[PDB]
Write a structure and sequence with these properties.
Elements: H1 26-31
Length: about 35
């Protein structure tokens, strides 16, 4: 389970705070070990 999480976002748009770069977390905190 790699990254590439389209991520949600919405505070501003699909980025809210910079391509939801902040939400990027998902990646190794969504694919990391808990698995999808």
């Amino acid at each position: 389970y790699p990254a590439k999480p389209e991520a949600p976002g919405e505070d501003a748009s699909p980025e809210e705070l910079s391509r939801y770069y902040a939400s990027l977390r998902h990646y190794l905190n969504l694919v990391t070990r808990q698995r999808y």
